[PDB]
């Protein structure tokens, strides 16, 4: 579900999923971004298994991501056949800056 | 239980024996006081074979003629992991050498333990008048103030098989069963220190004892 | 010797808990001596005929360089294990003057059963020397390893000042931890010291509270 | 309807038969006690369990 | 305390270092609407 | 334990140690009455008890209309009709074993199979 490898075939990405899907095989810096994202996901998995020892997946959290995904799919009419305009670096950087935009405390010191 | 010994039923039985407070009141059928004039042969015909090994093993010239016999229950030797030797040595070390104790073997048809109070060499013209009452007082503190095994404030321990979720080596979460000891009564400081358990996972219904033992957080 | 093995296991677990305590306080205790096994424990700290001795069990520890950088006000620590069950006035006096002559600011006395009140009254000694008495039965199991006990980290003076400044707090407005709490005794907290408590949160994953020692 | 009421009556009757069998075992002292509870408490637990599962 | 004392001008946090949320709260919105409507109802 | 009373003042007797014979003799504390003990047992205390379970059996126990009747076989006189009741001791841990009283010969017989 998560590992994307641009240098192998066991976890390769299908070129039909995105416009720049053929020329990204064998890339290095994009593979660096994927390795960083997958390492962060593995660390998240380990942290979640540390926090929830019983491995319960359903927990109360603020923003329903699934509803927003479905609203975007139905608003822009995702046909799930046309290749996507998204580049992978744009996806990774967008998720990262979204994480930096989730502000609960607005202080400008190390403790806050 | 210890995480490497979680599914061991007999090890959980050993822990249950190690933590449950068992006294002589839970094991003894009856307590009787007899008069045996000499500490060589008994006057009771049923324990003639019991005395004639232990008396021949051995002192007796300074022993009181009063005898304290306790008859125990066979089923109490079965539900509780107890034998005659453990009870005998516990009673011996509680009363030191002031009370000479012998016991029947575990294969005997009657579970009889016999006790005699050793007399001093000084002349006592009035102690023998109340010697029966003194032996009754010894028998009173014998029944409930002697703990055969386990830690205090533990009424009884029952044994459940709960179903915890453990990460499988393939990555999934599997419903691995575990033998867990539920307890009535709280002695959390003492129960945590016994071996064979996991002291990092012990939980108590009384959160007051958690704060006193583990901490405010 | 059945009881002696049980006491030897208790003493070995207490020694491991003491080593973990000293390592968590910031002093230099290496990892291989923390998990010293029972067979190597009996090979060193037990005599020929079997009784474990406690005089050579007593040891000395020094703070790490990181702990000097964070706390540049403490030096060595002395941990003593007692032999007699009831500690008299004379043994306590020899312990505190041995601390005095070797210039120890902290001394951990691990007694067996009890401290006599005639020796307990002089446990407060000349500043900055501090004496902490621990019972061996309370140290068989390390409480910090329990799943309910979260991570307690003692804050420095500058960290405490920054914490009070950024939240605009006074000392009394912080959550409190008493100076008899088992984790407070484990960390050796003095009055007015703040611990950052990092715990698991089911709503935000990680949560950092703070508690001042009263 | 009638077949369902007959089946319900049969269920209640077979639960009463099980309760009677447990009662005969207890009155013959052939019923073992569950751990942590007496003979009468175990008998009452078995009877209540049988009647509750009958009602269900 | 440590950063502010009594009722000096240090009570007023300057605009460049305001750490509160830039969003109007529901209580702030309710009281602003109430105060403005009360003023408008009094000409 | 068979408590024994003095034959003169009707007060209970107590065991005495004597060094003349070293025997068990019961002594009256009131009028100095001496008699010879028929048993060495001077004190008995049962923690589990088997007496009192058949308490209340009288010559007209079958006249009680509330007592249930059974059809069990009396193993003394072979009579089907009899009354029965549970153990009359009110301990919490007592068993539910039935005691049957035959109404023809007043014989007590239990339903206990562990004993039999
Ligand atoms: Zn008389
Ligand atoms: Zn009959």
User: Is residue B178 within a helix (H) or strand (E), and if so which, with residue range?
Assistant: strand B173-184
Q: How far is CA B206 from CA B203, B209, C150, C170, C200, in A?
A: 9, 6, 19, 33, 22
> Using only C-alpha atoms, what is the Rg of chain F?
21
Give the Cα separation of B139 and B99 in Å (integer): 11
Q: Please tell me if residue E4 touches chain C, with a CB cutoff of 8 Å.
A: yes
Token readout for C193 is 């010291």
Query: Going edge to edge, which strands form the sheet with C106-111?
Result: C59-61, C77-81, C106-111, C130-135
Number of structural domains, chain C? 2
Q: Any known ligand binding at F41?
A: no
Q: Which residues of C140-171 are buried (b: 16+ CB within 10 A; e: fewer)?
A: bbbbbebebbbebebbbeebbeebbebeeeee
Three-class HEC string of chain F: CCCCECCCCCCEEEEEECCCCCCEEEEECCCCCEEECCCCCCEEEECCCCCCCCCCCCCCHHHCCCCCEECCCCCCCCCCCEEEECCCCCCCCCCCCCEEEECCCCCEEECCCCCC
Burial of residue A96, with CB atoms counted within 10 A of its CB: 0-12 exposed, 13-18 middle, 19 or more buried:
middle
Q: What is the resolution of this structure in A?
A: 3.1
Nearest to F87 by CA among F53, F46, F43: F53
Residues of chain F with CATH 2.20.25.10: 1-45, 46-116
Contact (CB, 8 A) for C163 and A111: yes
Q: What fold, for F46-116?
A: N-terminal domain of TfIIb (2.20.25)
Distance in angstroms (rounded) separating the CA atoms of residues C14 and C137: 8
Beta bridge partners of B70: B31, B113
CA distance F44 to A75: 92
Q: Do A108 and E20 touch (CB under 8 A)?
A: no
Domain that includes residue B118, residue range:
11-149
Task: For residue C122, give both structure tokens.
Answer: 């002089």
* Closest to C115 in 3D by CA, of C132, C133, C131, C130: C133
Asked if B75 is an interface residue toward chain D (Cβ–Cβ < 8 A), one would say no
Q: Say what angle helices A88-101 and A29-51 make with each other, to 10 degrees.
A: 40
| Domain limit, last residue, from C120, C141, C162 | C141
Residues C153 and C98 placed together within one structural domain of the fold: no
Chain C residue with minimal CA distance to A109? C166
What secondary structure does DSSP assign to B152-171, as a single string?
A: SS--EEEEEEEEEEEE-TTS
Same domain, C29 and C128: yes
Contact present, A33 and A92 (Cβ < 8 Å): yes
Distance F27 CA to ligand 1 centre (A): 8
Please tell me whether residues C57 and C77 are part of one structural domain: yes
Please report where in the chains the tokens 């009890």 appear, as a residue: C114
Integer CA distances (angstroms), F19 to A88, B34, D28, in order? 108, 18, 53
The domain F1-45: what is its CATH number?
2.20.25.10
Tokens 């720049």 belong to A20
Residue C136 DSSP class? S
The alpha carbon dihedral of F8, F10, F11, F17 has a sign of positive
Please name the method used to determine this structure: cryo-EM
* Cβ of residue B205 closer than 8 Å to a chain C Cβ: no
Parent domain of C111: 1-141
Whether chain C has a CB inside 8 Å of the CB on B217: the answer is: yes
Please give the angle made by the CA atoms of A94, A99 and A105, to the nearest 5 degrees: 145
Measured distance between the N- and C-terminal CA atoms of chain F, rounded to whole angstroms: 28
Using the CB atoms, write b or e for A29-39: b if 16+ within 10 Å: ebbebbeebee
List CB contacts of A66: < 8 A, sequence separation 6 or more: none
> Rounded to 5 degrees, what angle do the CA atoms F77, F80, F86 make?
100
CB environment B23-61: b (16+ within 10 A), e (fewer): bbebbbbebbbbbbeebeebbbeebeebbeeeeeeeeee
Hunting for tokens 């020094």 — which residue is that?
Answer: C62
Q: Which residues pair with B165 in a beta bridge?
A: B175
Name the token pair of A85.
Answer: 């305009």
* SS3 of residue B22 by DSSP: strand
CATH number where B56 lies: 3.30.1360.140
For F8, half-sphere exposure in the C-beta direction (CA atoms, 13 angstrom radius) is 10
* Tokens, residue A41: 């996901």
| DSSP annotation of D33 | P
Q: Does chain A reach chain C with at least 3 CB pairs under 8 Å?
A: yes
Rg (CA), chain D: 14
3-class DSSP state for residue B175?
Answer: strand
Cβ C201–A111 below 8 Å, yes or no?
no
- Residues F114 and B108: their CA atoms lie apart, in Å, by 20
Q: What is the rounded distance in angstroms from the CA atom of residue C159 to the CA atom of residue C194? A: 9
Q: Please, which residues have CB less than 5 A from ligand 1, an ion? A: F 6, 8-9, 28, 30-31, 33
Tell me whether residue F86 is annotated as binding: no
Chains B and E contact (Cβ–Cβ under 8 Å for 3 or more pairs): no
């Amino acid at each position: 579900r998560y590992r994307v490898d641009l240098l192998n075939t066991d976890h390769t990405l299908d070129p039909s999923l995105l416009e720049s899907g053929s020329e990204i095989l064998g890339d290095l810096k994009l593979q660096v971004l994927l390795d960083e994202e997958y390492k962060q996901l593995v660390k998240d998995r380990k942290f979640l298994r540390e926090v929830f020892v019983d491995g319960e997946a359903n927990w109360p959290l603020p923003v329903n991501i699934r509803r927003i995904i479905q609203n975007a799919q139905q608003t822009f009419h995702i046909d799930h056949t046309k290749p996507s305009d998204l580049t992978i670096k744009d996806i990774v950087l967008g998720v990262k800056d979204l994480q930096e935009n989730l502000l609960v405390l607005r202080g400008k010191n190390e403790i806050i | 239980l210890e995480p490497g010994h979680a599914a061991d039923q007999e090890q959980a039985k050993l822990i249950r024996s190690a933590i449950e407070h068992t006294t002589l009141k839970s094991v003894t059928i009856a307590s009787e006081i007899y008069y045996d004039p000499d500490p060589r042969s008994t006057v009771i015909p049923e324990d003639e074979e019991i005395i004639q090994l232990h008396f021949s093993l051995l002192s007796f010239d300074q022993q009181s003629p009063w005898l304290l016999r306790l008859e125990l229950d066979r089923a109490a030797m079965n539900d509780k992991d107890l034998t005659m030797g453990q009870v005998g040595e516990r009673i011996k070390q509680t009363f030191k050498n002031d009370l000479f104790v012998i016991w029947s073997e575990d294969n005997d048809e009657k579970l009889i333990i016999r006790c005699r109070v050793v007399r001093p060499k000084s002349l006592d013209a009035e102690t023998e008048a109340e010697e029966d009452h003194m032996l009754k007082k010894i028998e009173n503190t014998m029944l409930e103030n002697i703990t055969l095994r386990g830690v205090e404030n533990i009424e009884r321990v029952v044994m459940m098989k709960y179903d915890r979720k453990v990460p499988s080596p393939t990555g999934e979460y599997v419903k691995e069963p575990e033998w867990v000891l539920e307890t009535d009564g709280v002695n959390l400081s003492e129960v945590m220190t016994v071996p064979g358990i996991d002291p990092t996972r012990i939980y108590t219904n009384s959160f007051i004892d958690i704060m006193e033992v583990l901490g405010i957080e | 010797d059945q009881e002696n093995e049980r006491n030897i296991s208790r003493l070995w677990r207490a020694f491991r808990t003491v080593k973990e305590m000293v390592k968590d306080r910031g002093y230099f205790i290496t990892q291989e001596e923390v998990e010293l096994p029972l067979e190597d424990f009996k090979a060193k700290y037990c005599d020929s005929m079997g009784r474990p001795q406690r005089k050579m069990m007593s040891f000395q520890a020094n703070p790490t360089e990181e702990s000097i950088s964070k706390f540049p006000d403490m030096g060595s620590l002395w941990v003593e294990f007692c032999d007699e069950p009831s500690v008299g006035v004379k043994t306590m006096k020899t312990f505190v003057i041995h601390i005095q002559e070797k210039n120890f600011q902290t001394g951990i006395f691990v007694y067996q059963n009890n401290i006599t009140p005639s020796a307990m009254k002089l446990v407060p000694s000349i500043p900055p020397a501090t004496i902490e008495t621990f019972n061996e039965a309370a140290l068989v199991v390390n409480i910090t390893h329990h799943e309910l006990v979260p991570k307690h980290i003692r804050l420095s003076s500058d960290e405490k000042r920054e914490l009070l400044k950024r939240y605009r707090l006074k000392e009394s407005q912080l959550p409190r931890i008493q100076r008899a709490d088992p984790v407070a005794l484990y960390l050796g907290l003095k009055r007015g010291e703040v611990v950052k408590i990092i715990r698991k949160s089911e709503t935000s994953g990680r949560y950092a509270s703070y508690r001042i020692c009263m | 309807d009638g077949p369902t009421m007959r089946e319900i009556t049969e269920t209640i009757a077979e639960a009463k038969k099980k309760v009677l069998d447990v009662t005969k075992e207890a009155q013959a002292n052939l019923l073992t006690a569950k751990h942590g509870m007496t003979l009468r408490e175990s008998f009452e637990d078995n009877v209540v369990r049988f009647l509750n599962e009958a009602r269900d | 305390e440590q950063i502010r004392r009594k009722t000096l001008k240090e009570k007023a946090i300057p605009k460049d270092q305001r750490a509160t949320t830039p969003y109007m709260t529901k209580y702030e919105r309710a009281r602003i609407l109430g105060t403005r409507a009360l003023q408008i109802s009094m000409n | 334990t068979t408590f024994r009373f003095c034959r003169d003042c009707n007060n209970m007797l107590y065991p005495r140690e004597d060094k003349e014979n070293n025997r068990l003799l019961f002594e009256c504390r009131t009028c100095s009455y001496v008699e010879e003990a028929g048993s060495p047992l001077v004190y008995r205390h049962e923690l589990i008890t088997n007496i009192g379970e058949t308490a209340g059996v009288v010559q007209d126990i079958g006249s009680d209309p509330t007592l249930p009747r059974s059809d069990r076989e009396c193993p003394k006189c072979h009579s089907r009709e009899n009354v029965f009741f549970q153990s009359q001791q009110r301990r919490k841990d007592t068993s539910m074993v039935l005691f049957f009283v035959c109404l023809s010969c007043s014989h007590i017989f239990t339903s206990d199979q562990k004993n039999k």
